[PDB]
Amino acid sequence: TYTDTQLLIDGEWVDAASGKTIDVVNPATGKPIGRVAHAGIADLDRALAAAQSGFEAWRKVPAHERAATMRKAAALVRERADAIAQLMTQEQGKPLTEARVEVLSAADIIEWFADEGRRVYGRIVPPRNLGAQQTVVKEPVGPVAAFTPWNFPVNQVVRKLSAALATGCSFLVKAPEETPASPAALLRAFVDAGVPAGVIGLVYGDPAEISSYLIPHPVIRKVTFTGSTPVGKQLASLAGLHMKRATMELGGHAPVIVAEDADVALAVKAAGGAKFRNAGQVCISPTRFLVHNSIRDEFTRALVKHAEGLKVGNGLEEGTTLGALANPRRLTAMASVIDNARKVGASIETGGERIGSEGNFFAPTVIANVPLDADVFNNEPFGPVAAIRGFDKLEEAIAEANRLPFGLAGYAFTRSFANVHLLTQRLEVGMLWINQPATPWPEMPFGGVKDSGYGSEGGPEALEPYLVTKSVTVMA
Amino acid sequence: TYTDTQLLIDGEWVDAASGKTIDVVNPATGKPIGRVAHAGIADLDRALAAAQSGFEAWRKVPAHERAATMRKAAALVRERADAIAQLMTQEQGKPLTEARVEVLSAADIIEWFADEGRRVYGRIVPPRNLGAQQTVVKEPVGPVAAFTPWNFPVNQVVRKLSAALATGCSFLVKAPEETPASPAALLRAFVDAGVPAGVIGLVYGDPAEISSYLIPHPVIRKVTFTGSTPVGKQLASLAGLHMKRATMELGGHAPVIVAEDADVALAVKAAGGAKFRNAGQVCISPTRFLVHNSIRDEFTRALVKHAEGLKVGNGLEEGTTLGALANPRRLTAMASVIDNARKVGASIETGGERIGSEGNFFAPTVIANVPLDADVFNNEPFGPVAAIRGFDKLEEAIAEANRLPFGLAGYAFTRSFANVHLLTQRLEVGMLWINQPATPWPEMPFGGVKDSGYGSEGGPEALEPYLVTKSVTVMA
Amino acid sequence: TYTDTQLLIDGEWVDAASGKTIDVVNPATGKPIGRVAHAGIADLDRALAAAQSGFEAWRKVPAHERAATMRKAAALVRERADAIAQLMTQEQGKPLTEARVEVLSAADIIEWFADEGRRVYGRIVPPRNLGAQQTVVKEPVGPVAAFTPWNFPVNQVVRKLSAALATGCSFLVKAPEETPASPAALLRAFVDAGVPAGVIGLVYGDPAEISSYLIPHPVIRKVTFTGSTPVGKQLASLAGLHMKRATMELGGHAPVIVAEDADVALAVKAAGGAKFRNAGQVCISPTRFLVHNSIRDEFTRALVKHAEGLKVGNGLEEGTTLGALANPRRLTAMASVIDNARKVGASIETGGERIGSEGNFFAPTVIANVPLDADVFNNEPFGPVAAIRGFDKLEEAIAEANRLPFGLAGYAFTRSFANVHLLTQRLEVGMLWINQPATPWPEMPFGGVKDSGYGSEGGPEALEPYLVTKSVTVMA
Amino acid sequence: TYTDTQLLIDGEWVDAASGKTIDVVNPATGKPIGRVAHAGIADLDRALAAAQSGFEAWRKVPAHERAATMRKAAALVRERADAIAQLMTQEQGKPLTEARVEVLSAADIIEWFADEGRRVYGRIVPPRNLGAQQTVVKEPVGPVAAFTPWNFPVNQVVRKLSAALATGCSFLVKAPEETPASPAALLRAFVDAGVPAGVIGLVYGDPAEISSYLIPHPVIRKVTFTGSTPVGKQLASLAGLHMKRATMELGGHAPVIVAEDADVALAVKAAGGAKFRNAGQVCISPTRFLVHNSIRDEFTRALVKHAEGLKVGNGLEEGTTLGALANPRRLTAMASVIDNARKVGASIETGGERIGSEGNFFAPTVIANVPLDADVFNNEPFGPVAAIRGFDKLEEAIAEANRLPFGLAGYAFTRSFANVHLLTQRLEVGMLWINQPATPWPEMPFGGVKDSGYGSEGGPEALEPYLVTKSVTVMA
């Protein structure tokens, strides 16, 4: 089974006013599995009024009470994690084992942010005149509009929602029409835990119509988007025209630097595992493997061996470790990336093809001998493709790593302090993981640089985009 | 004496390749006093290249060395304060005494920021696996494009410049064509102190063309603009379209709430004195005077008396306490504000006319019986005009204070703790001063909310728009 | 019912080696209710070995796991709060309603410290040479010896224990022989929640023999004591002789300043309620009431009215609001304080006598017209006695407030910002509460100044006495 | 030239009421050079009264004014660096070049602390009831009694003095009778800068009698001592008996771990150079050289060569790189250390004798084949003596590094990240420097663990022993 999804407005699950719905298909099959309410402008006016009213309510609830309510939502997300994961796998394609991991960590994230909300500290500044008190108070910015994409239906809502809620903001999210049930199950946990009516809202419909209406509207004080770099540029431009606070989490093109002193088995296990996680459909997925010439061939073979050991299948089989891609455009885009690679003289080491003629299954693919003008080494592939090149000198790996307008994550494998320290200072990324896969715990900052966007969704830094800082000076 | 001003590119004071200049007028007389170079695209290209190199240089200079270099520049600014102030008054209109105060407070800013650059701290997070070290590191964002207005020619530059230098970014500023010499003099103190070629640049010319070229350019990593709300919106739109970090300090419309228990005489002294400072051409200037009805008449008359005491004349003549407005557009703008007040039934209690027929002199003006639809109570007048309205309940004054889309500064006068705490919580402003005029020290955050923009220019918060946060996790 | 109490050593509840026990009496009755193991030196050697081994174990458990374990202990303390409170009332005398409040808030404290342990942050310092990394790491100091008194058997263990546990330290507490069962029930929750063997230890016996042995012993790296000022001086002296880190929470003598603009009903309700809480047996209990002459008489009558409305009785009756004093020396000391008051010419307004001839019931007592040489206005009474004097000028109240070598808490009632600000800057206390009773939440610092001791048991500051800070600089 | 030194009391350089003096010797010659006033109880009484008044004064001076005053003092210290260094070398023994370095680094300290005084921040805690404001405020503790040793006469004073002045405490120091003039000269820079009468005081005399009088005295709120472990224990015992805040910087015994992958030449240059700095009379001097057996012989010979290169002679003669030891007790102490090394079977590889028959000259000495029971490997030698021992496993070196009750500084040389991280975690020291000598900058914490005491003299942490934390909760 798989349920139809409704809008959440003012504490109620409701149909759109007009009754219109959008069909939802299972990517592993191509067959309808349900429908989602298609909101129009009238449903949006009701969500906005409600968000305003919810903000006036929520900002008055003391932080410790807000925290206890959020921890209650978290316990419910944990309990319902298998049922929610089954919804997710069906609508998005990832393996059930991966969906379960995603939802359980959603509960972890909520819990950390609930406690963070109690530690939004102000400051007292030693004054220039002892007869005055000089303070810096932090307070919530107001109603937030969030736009979240399909690759992690739950986890891309959960950080934004948790940070908003921990600060005293209300929250109105447009989630993906193609993966709508698992984000709605997340918000249902919050409604059941006692977050009052209007603090949270959820809508689905025509993405352009919704974002063009919410972002200029005077109820909304803060906008947050995660998605593609070109769509973000369009939304950050609209937000700027209406002077709205904005954060953006966009495309990455993560380099992997395998230094001469690297453990190779480890690199392959850690970066290769990470590459094929959610079929490469991750803003932090390692893409450009820069491997020292001394071990390049050995690395390339071991990666090929890892790709070929993946069990492609419908994500509901527990043994499936590579599911279908999320939707048919991902096939088109993977076909295009692989064509261009062949055309520019790269070698397709394994994979490189659609599997079957039903659903969106594409084969895990490793490209070697990749020239620098290849599409895969310039545009974000966002799919189950690795591209390998060699280097001699660590300084040339770093410059390659920094060549692109992205961005976001980077990985490396090395053992010397000197290399760790050099990669730390020089690599143009928001997050760098060395000798392990990505472990984006909620207490670590998470966000990009350059075209990958700005603002963090972890650590205390994650609260700041939702806060206003106010200087107060009172002469006694 | 008044000097002609050049562009600063890659260590060198130079003319524009085209040789073009713009005439500089003294607002007190209407008479030409000098000229400034009118930069074109070609000179911007050399500034941008120089900025790139300067960033590579300055990012490598240890913070304690950057700090000592910045502190020398500040010592130079102090040494040259009379000369700088003389240039400012001539080009901008303010009295010599206020110019000197601006220039000295510039030095105070540079010093605080010099020291703050040494305290851009990272952090170490207790890890989930004890074999890994989880750190968060702070780094400079990159080359900055800055755009600054004419109201405080030196001070609007210095906070942006100081922030950028303390973090290790390079800095390219477009300063006002109408007030070129005093900022160029500030920049010349930094060159003479030892800031290397390319780290700082200064251009003048057509503002639209400079903005449109610098903001989309891939060398610029971060944009900062101080100015009016409409231009900031156009600039933030563009920044967004090209995914640039942006901060904005825009229009204010500061309410002043004089409560039933206020010390009226202190209220007149503090907020009257602040009103006519720089002839009200200040983003935090008290404008909407909300006075409890019990003391409204007493307050109006005392404010009228304070306006009448002011000595209007040329800024070089000692005695002068209110100079000329900075340009002919401000006179037209004041007559419109006053014509509208009268049209809508308000009473001009004093002032309200041009003085003489040469230069930009406007009498200090107090308006009462102001209806809620008068231009002065909706648009930022940015001029030597106070508007007074009465209230009965503090709650009504608070709701009026929040009514407009602006939210920069707020003022109040009251003695009860409960009202301090209420005002602190409820007022939608970035900065609030109670029982005193504004004292915007560099250690205090300084920035807006709503249509007044975002990002702070004081406190440790002023460094954050100039920094990227990198999560680094290394497994042993 | 009421249970006999054992030692906790190495995960096991055990008798002392020798079999010796100490009888426990109910203060409301004077009758034996049980016994507690009397530890000797051999039991201490076993506790110390175990604490060493527990420290090596606990310091290796990642913080998030430590937190989850502590939150589990907390949920068990919450569930068992009524059963634990019944033990407490019996052995200590406080009303059951007060005992329940104490234990429930113990669970709150644990939960806040569990999350605090995850936020023990290090720092990265911008280096003087870019080739080095300069860091500040925080790590646990080691095995802690804690000595806790009888007035709040559970809450004086719980803060020390929680802070130790959140930092990675092991913990060995000597709890009170006269109130031993409710602290043992607290530690039992931690054992049941999965804190491993030896991380926590609990012993009872001859207070001088235990503290003389634990404090010099090389396993113990940190000592913490809460109790009387003269006993602390002796223990801080021993700790200093063996160079052991020490914190001390000692006697208070809390002033209450009721200013001329005070709400009187509120002052009486808030400070009077607080005075008779746990029969005045609290280091923060308001003792010296300094009331403005204009309302002194009205305050004195309303306090008398509050004291006379207390229902004296055995604490197990739900309606009892003043229980018996904790032990027979409290009667002797209250007899002495009241004698001296009468002798120096003070007036006993109500109470002043033992009630009955069984148990330790003393009457709630209010003394007025108190000269400055009266014992009650110099030595900490630690019992159900208030002492009232007048003042004319707020500055004279403050000097009186600051006259004594204590210390700890202070209270006031006033409405003006000016007074709030003056009391804030001038009053020599660790904690100041204004227009309310004490609400010592775990997120607020808690500790004294002067003879009241040093170190805080709340806020992040509470972790620092358990941490070592290490500067690390590594040249690449 | 060398000058006689006086007491500094309440703004005035004065003699002791008794008129007594102590002779000051030049350690390089044995010859008298001057005298210092020998303070008695009566002069201490005037210092204590003056300290009380000075505290009342300085606590009222806004932090930005305190900072500017401190920065002037620092500018004076720089101006007078040759003169101060001349006094130091004469009285203390170190070469002129090292004295000048000490004096200049003093100025650097004062400046950092000046700036840190402006950033003693309080905080605002999200409240449990929104009608209350919960703040935590920082205040100066009160008058300080400081006791400082002869090894860095100016530098051991300056950190304590700077900390105390930045927080707003007053300061009374007993400096070394054997090296009086250079600290008095430092204190004279603060008097000439404008620090008011009473805020700073300076006495000399009988150390025991001064200590016993100042520590129990009710004017003294905080004690700080730098010195040997046995005297610190006696002083901490007394501080404790009178419930005074105390910090202690005591004996160190720094291990140096040269790992199998070390750069041996850098190891010799960094830790050899640091060994003979101030002829090893430093609390963080490398002493126990633990060298991997593979490179031990290479290391020993290179260190012997570096010791042999040093130029022994009077500190005023240029060329001199190792001066005389500071007093005759240090010669006796070195002969004992060397007599014991030889008795226990170690080999003296170079040095190990007195040079000449006048003054306190000792040859730079390297000892190898050192058994674990030799005095040099258990007691702090505080002299120009390195002891070398080999190891096979890094784990054995780490367990030796931790074996002693001292734990001040530690050094290592290694290239692998895993060893940096291991050493960082496992070494029981306050400060660790890897691949470089010690660089104790004022922004880095500086303090011990175990028998080396407690409290930091660097970083923001250096201010915390000089501050009290006050929780303030005000209900509207």
Side-chain angles (χ1 to χ4, degrees), chain B residues 49-117:
Chain B
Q52 186 60 52
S53 292
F55 172 57
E56 278 144 28
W58 192 237
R59 78 176 308 162
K60 273 157 191 156
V61 172
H64 75 107
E65 293 179 22
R66 292 200 294 249
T69 297
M70 290 174 71
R71 271 184 168 280
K72 282 178 198 159
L76 286 168
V77 172
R78 288 219 176 75
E79 266 189 356
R80 297 165 192 192
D82 301 324
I84 294 168
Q86 293 252 329
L87 292 173
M88 189 186 306
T89 286
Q90 282 185 283
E91 69 194 352
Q92 189 276 348
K94 70 184 73 197
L96 217 31
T97 187
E98 305 196 23
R100 184 150 185 292
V101 165
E102 172 165 358
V103 168
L104 291 175
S105 104
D108 193 64
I109 291 157
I110 294 161
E111 290 164 346
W112 192 88
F113 278 83
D115 300 339
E116 198 61 29

Side-chain angles (χ1 to χ4, degrees), chain D residues 85-433:
Chain D
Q86 293 252 329
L87 292 173
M88 189 186 306
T89 286
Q90 282 185 283
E91 69 194 352
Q92 189 276 348
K94 70 184 73 197
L96 217 31
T97 187
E98 305 196 23
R100 184 150 185 292
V101 165
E102 172 165 358
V103 168
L104 291 175
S105 104
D108 193 64
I109 291 157
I110 294 161
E111 290 164 346
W112 192 88
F113 278 83
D115 300 339
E116 198 61 29
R118 299 183 59 187
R119 299 168 168 83
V120 171
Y121 292 132
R123 85 165 171 285
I124 296 179
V125 182
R128 300 226 191 179
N129 186 308
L130 262 68
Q133 182 202 60
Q134 293 175 213
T135 57
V136 175
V137 301
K138 309 297 296 195
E139 289 160 359
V141 66
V144 183
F147 306 80
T148 59
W150 41 263
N151 73 329
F152 297 82
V154 164
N155 260 30
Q156 306 280 33
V157 172
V158 75
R159 293 172 177 262
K160 299 179 179 312
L161 171 67
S162 299
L165 289 179
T167 56
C169 300
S170 57
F171 189 79
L172 169 48
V173 49
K174 189 222 78 68
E177 293 69 37
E178 293 172 319
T179 73
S182 63
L186 171 80
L187 263 64
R188 186 182 299 280
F190 285 85
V191 178
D192 302 345
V195 171
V199 177
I200 51 171
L202 177 60
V203 295
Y204 300 92
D206 186 296
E209 181 188 39
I210 292 167
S211 282
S212 304
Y213 195 72
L214 294 190
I215 292 167
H217 200 280
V219 173
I220 299 302
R221 287 283 173 86
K222 188 259 187 299
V223 169
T224 171
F225 168 85
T226 294
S228 80
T229 297
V231 170
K233 290 179 169 161
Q234 299 297 315
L235 300 187
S237 188
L238 194 66
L241 178 67
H242 293 100
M243 198 54 53
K244 305 301 178 96
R245 302 285 282 276
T247 57
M248 297 269 139
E249 193 183 293
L250 304 184
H253 208 296
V256 188
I257 292 176
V258 185
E260 171 167 36
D261 65 345
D263 180 342
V264 176
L266 171 64
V268 171
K269 178 186 190 281
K275 178 43 163 172
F276 298 110
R277 187 170 77 94
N278 199 24
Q281 308 167 304
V282 195
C283 57
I284 65 177
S285 180
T287 305
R288 286 187 290 147
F289 284 85
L290 304 170
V291 188
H292 188 73
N293 283 136
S294 84
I295 46 160
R296 184 173 43 70
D297 281 18
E298 165 180 20
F299 181 91
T300 304
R301 287 186 290 258
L303 187 55
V304 163
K305 231 217 143 190
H306 178 263
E308 283 167 358
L310 296 178
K311 177 44 182 123
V312 189
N314 178 319
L316 298 166
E317 294 193 336
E318 65 190 329
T320 296
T321 49
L322 176 80
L325 303 191
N327 53 77
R329 275 182 294 104
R330 290 280 97 223
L331 269 183
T332 311
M334 289 306 92
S336 166
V337 170
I338 277 66
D339 293 335
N340 171 94
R342 267 198 259 263
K343 178 176 155 92
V344 306
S347 58
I348 309 306
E349 297 295 316
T350 193
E353 300 294 315
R354 194 190 184 166
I355 290 161
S357 41
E358 286 295 310
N360 313 139
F361 299 105
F362 206 86
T365 301
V366 171
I367 297 179
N369 302 303
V370 186
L372 275 173
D373 74 321
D375 284 347
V376 70
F377 246 69
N378 300 277
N379 303 338
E380 170 182 54
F382 215 71
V385 189
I388 302 171
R389 195 170 156 80
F391 71 89
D392 301 314
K393 323 204 84 147
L394 186 50
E395 190 222 41
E396 298 161 1
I398 288 172
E400 178 33 41
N402 295 335
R403 178 178 55 91
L404 300 178
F406 303 104
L408 183 50
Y411 303 86
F413 297 91
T414 191
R415 290 166 160 110
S416 93
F417 180 78
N419 292 355
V420 163
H421 172 72
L422 186 61
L423 283 159
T424 295
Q425 282 169 324
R426 298 279 333 274
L427 276 170
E428 294 186 304
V429 298
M431 320 162 277
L432 182 59
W433 287 281

Side-chain angles (χ1 to χ4, degrees), chain A residues 221 424 445 461 470-471 473, chain B residues 123 424 428 434 445 470-471:
Chain A
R221 309 284 258 243
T424 289
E461 292 86 347
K470 199 193 306 186
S471 280
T473 301
Chain B
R123 85 165 171 285
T424 295
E428 294 186 304
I434 293 166
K470 191 189 290 174
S471 288

Side-chain angles (χ1 to χ4, degrees), chain C residues 59 108 123 125-126 128 132 134-139 221 229 232-234 236-238 240-245 248 250 420 423-436 439 441-447 449-451 453-454 459-461 468-475, chain D residues 59 108 123 125-126 128 132 134-139 221 232-234 236-238 240-245 248 250 420 423-436 439 441-446 449-454 459-461 468-476:
Chain C
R59 75 178 313 172
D108 192 76
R123 188 163 78 255
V125 175
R128 293 224 191 179
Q134 286 167 221
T135 64
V136 191
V137 306
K138 304 278 196 215
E139 74 194 31
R221 309 284 258 243
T229 287
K233 280 175 178 174
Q234 296 296 314
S237 183
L238 190 70
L241 188 49
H242 292 94
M243 200 46 57
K244 301 306 187 57
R245 298 275 290 284
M248 296 273 135
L250 309 181
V420 170
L423 294 158
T424 289
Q425 296 196 312
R426 292 286 324 290
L427 214 27
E428 288 180 343
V429 299
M431 300 141 288
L432 170 59
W433 290 275
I434 302 185
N435 303 339
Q436 51 167 81
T439 50
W441 308 126
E443 56 268 40
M444 297 302 289
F446 187 113
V449 127
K450 298 145 85 180
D451 281 15
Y454 41 79
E461 292 86 347
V468 300
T469 107
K470 199 193 306 186
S471 280
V472 186
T473 301
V474 190
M475 178 72 78
Chain D
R59 78 176 308 162
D108 193 64
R123 85 165 171 285
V125 182
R128 300 226 191 179
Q134 293 175 213
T135 57
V136 175
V137 301
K138 309 297 296 195
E139 289 160 359
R221 287 283 173 86
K233 290 179 169 161
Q234 299 297 315
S237 188
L238 194 66
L241 178 67
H242 293 100
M243 198 54 53
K244 305 301 178 96
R245 302 285 282 276
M248 297 269 139
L250 304 184
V420 163
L423 283 159
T424 295
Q425 282 169 324
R426 298 279 333 274
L427 276 170
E428 294 186 304
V429 298
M431 320 162 277
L432 182 59
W433 287 281
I434 293 166
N435 297 342
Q436 59 165 88
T439 55
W441 313 114
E443 63 272 31
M444 290 307 278
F446 185 112
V449 142
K450 292 154 74 193
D451 279 12
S452 304
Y454 38 79
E461 296 83 346
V468 300
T469 299
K470 191 189 290 174
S471 288
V472 177
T473 304
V474 189
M475 182 70 88

Side-chain angles (χ1 to χ4, degrees), chain B residues 116-462:
Chain B
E116 198 61 29
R118 299 183 59 187
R119 299 168 168 83
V120 171
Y121 292 132
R123 85 165 171 285
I124 296 179
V125 182
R128 300 226 191 179
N129 186 308
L130 262 68
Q133 182 202 60
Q134 293 175 213
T135 57
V136 175
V137 301
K138 309 297 296 195
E139 289 160 359
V141 66
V144 183
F147 306 80
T148 59
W150 41 263
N151 73 329
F152 297 82
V154 164
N155 260 30
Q156 306 280 33
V157 172
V158 75
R159 293 172 177 262
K160 299 179 179 312
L161 171 67
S162 299
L165 289 179
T167 56
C169 300
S170 57
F171 189 79
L172 169 48
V173 49
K174 189 222 78 68
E177 293 69 37
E178 293 172 319
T179 73
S182 63
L186 171 80
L187 263 64
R188 186 182 299 280
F190 285 85
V191 178
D192 302 345
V195 171
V199 177
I200 51 171
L202 177 60
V203 295
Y204 300 92
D206 186 296
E209 181 188 39
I210 292 167
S211 282
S212 304
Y213 195 72
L214 294 190
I215 292 167
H217 200 280
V219 173
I220 299 302
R221 287 283 173 86
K222 188 259 187 299
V223 169
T224 171
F225 168 85
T226 294
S228 80
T229 297
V231 170
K233 290 179 169 161
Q234 299 297 315
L235 300 187
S237 188
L238 194 66
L241 178 67
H242 293 100
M243 198 54 53
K244 305 301 178 96
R245 302 285 282 276
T247 57
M248 297 269 139
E249 193 183 293
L250 304 184
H253 208 296
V256 188
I257 292 176
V258 185
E260 171 167 36
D261 65 345
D263 180 342
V264 176
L266 171 64
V268 171
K269 178 186 190 281
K275 178 43 163 172
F276 298 110
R277 187 170 77 94
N278 199 24
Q281 308 167 304
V282 195
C283 57
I284 65 177
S285 180
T287 305
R288 286 187 290 147
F289 284 85
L290 304 170
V291 188
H292 188 73
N293 283 136
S294 84
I295 46 160
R296 184 173 43 70
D297 281 18
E298 165 180 20
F299 181 91
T300 304
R301 287 186 290 258
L303 187 55
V304 163
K305 231 217 143 190
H306 178 263
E308 283 167 358
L310 296 178
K311 177 44 182 123
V312 189
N314 178 319
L316 298 166
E317 294 193 336
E318 65 190 329
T320 296
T321 49
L322 176 80
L325 303 191
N327 53 77
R329 275 182 294 104
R330 290 280 97 223
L331 269 183
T332 311
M334 289 306 92
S336 166
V337 170
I338 277 66
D339 293 335
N340 171 94
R342 267 198 259 263
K343 178 176 155 92
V344 306
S347 58
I348 309 306
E349 297 295 316
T350 193
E353 300 294 315
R354 194 190 184 166
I355 290 161
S357 41
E358 286 295 310
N360 313 139
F361 299 105
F362 206 86
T365 301
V366 171
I367 297 179
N369 302 303
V370 186
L372 275 173
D373 74 321
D375 284 347
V376 70
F377 246 69
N378 300 277
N379 303 338
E380 170 182 54
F382 215 71
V385 189
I388 302 171
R389 195 170 156 80
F391 71 89
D392 301 314
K393 323 204 84 147
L394 186 50
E395 190 222 41
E396 298 161 1
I398 288 172
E400 178 33 41
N402 295 335
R403 178 178 55 91
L404 300 178
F406 303 104
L408 183 50
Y411 303 86
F413 297 91
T414 191
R415 290 166 160 110
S416 93
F417 180 78
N419 292 355
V420 163
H421 172 72
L422 186 61
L423 283 159
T424 295
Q425 282 169 324
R426 298 279 333 274
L427 276 170
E428 294 186 304
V429 298
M431 320 162 277
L432 182 59
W433 287 281
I434 293 166
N435 297 342
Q436 59 165 88
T439 55
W441 313 114
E443 63 272 31
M444 290 307 278
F446 185 112
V449 142
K450 292 154 74 193
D451 279 12
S452 304
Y454 38 79
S456 180
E457 297 192 329
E461 296 83 346

